[PDB]
C-alpha cells in the first residue's frame, strides 16, 4: 500500500512546516510511514505550501518522498491501489498502528466490494474539533483509486492520534511527545 499525505486557524500559515520540538510537523507523519509498511509516500502540495515542497525536496531529496501538486485527489493517478491518505498534522502516530489499519482494511474486503475511516472514541480524544456521535476522526483514511463514490467503513482504535488545528492544539501536541 502506498500513501498520500495531504498537504486557516492559527494564522493559516502552512502548518506542516510548523515546528514542534525542533522538528517540522510533517516529519512526525513521514516518520511512521517510512518505518511504515506503506512504502511509497506521496506528499500532495499546493500553494502556500510551496515552502513545504521545498523543505521536502531538500530534506528528503535522497528519499522516495515525492511531492505532488479545496480537496483535490487529483492524486489517484499515482496509486494503482488503495492508499492511505493522512493529514500532515498527526501526533502520536505509529507504524504499528498503521499496520493495523492497512491490515484491517484487507481483512474486511475479506467481505466487500472502498474507503476506510479511522476514528477515535471520544473518551480517548480531548478537545476535539469534530465529534461525529462520539467518534473523532483521526485524519487517517484508506481509499481506492477513483474519483467518484466509495463505500466507506469505519475503524475504531483506542489509541489516540491527535491532529493540530489550533495553537492550543500545539500545547497538547508537545504535551504528547
Ligand X SMILES: Nc1nc2c(ncn2[C@@H]2O[C@H](COP(=O)(O)OP(=O)(O)OP(=O)(O)O)[C@@H](O)[C@H]2O)c(=O)[nH]1
Instruction: List contacts with ligand X (CB under 6 A).
Output: 6-9, 12, 15-16, 44-46, 49, 70-71, 87-89, 165
Min. distance of Cβ 70 from ligand X in angstroms?
Answer: 5
Residue 115 burial (C-beta neighbours within 10 Å; 0-12, 13-18, 19+): middle
Min. distance of Cβ 40 from ligand X in angstroms?
Answer: 18
Distance in angstroms (rounded) separating the CA atoms of residues 29 and 152 = 23
* Secondary structure E strands in the chain: 2-6, 19-20, 23-24, 41-44, 65-68, 83-87, 90-91, 115-121, 135-143, 152-156, 162-163
Nearer CB in complex with ligand X: 15/37: 15
In the complex, residue closest to ligand X by CB: 46
Min. distance of Cβ 71 from ligand X in angstroms?
Answer: 6
Nearer CB in complex with ligand X: 9/35: 9
Strand partners, 41: 3, 65
Nearer CB in complex with ligand X: 9/96: 9
Amino acid at each position: 500500500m502506498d500513501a498520500l499525505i495531504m498537504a486557516t486557524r492559527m494564522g493559516g500559515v502552512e502548518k506542516p512546516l510548523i515546528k514542534l520540538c525542533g522538528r517540522c510537523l510533517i516529519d512526525y507523519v513521514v516518520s511512521p510511514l517510512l518505518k511504515s509498511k506503506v512504502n511509497n509516500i506521496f506528499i500532495a502540495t499546493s500553494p502556500n505550501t510551496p515552502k513545504t515542497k521545498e523543505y521536502i525536496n531538500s530534506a528528503y531529496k535522497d528519499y522516495k518522498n515525492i511531492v505532488v501538486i479545496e480537496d483535490l485527489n487529483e492524486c489517484i493517478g499515482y496509486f494503482s491501489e488503495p492508499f492511505l491518505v493522512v493529514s500532515s498534522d498527526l501526533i502520536n502516530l505509529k507504524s504499528k498502528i498503521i499496520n493495523s489499519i492497512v491490515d484491517y482494511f484487507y481483512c474486511i474486503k475479506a467481505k466487500t466490494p472502498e474507503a476506510l475511516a479511522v476514528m477515535i472514541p471520544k473518551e480517548k480524544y480531548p478537545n476535539p474539533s469534530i465529534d461525529f456521535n462520539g467518534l473523532v476522526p483521526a485524519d487517517i483514511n484508506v481509499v481506492s483509486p477513483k474519483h467518484g463514490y466509495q463505500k466507506e467503513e469505519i475503524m475504531v482504535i483506542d489509541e489516540l492520534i491527535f491532529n493540530i488545528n489550533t495553537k492550543d492544539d500545539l500545547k497538547l501536541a508537545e504535551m504528547l511527545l
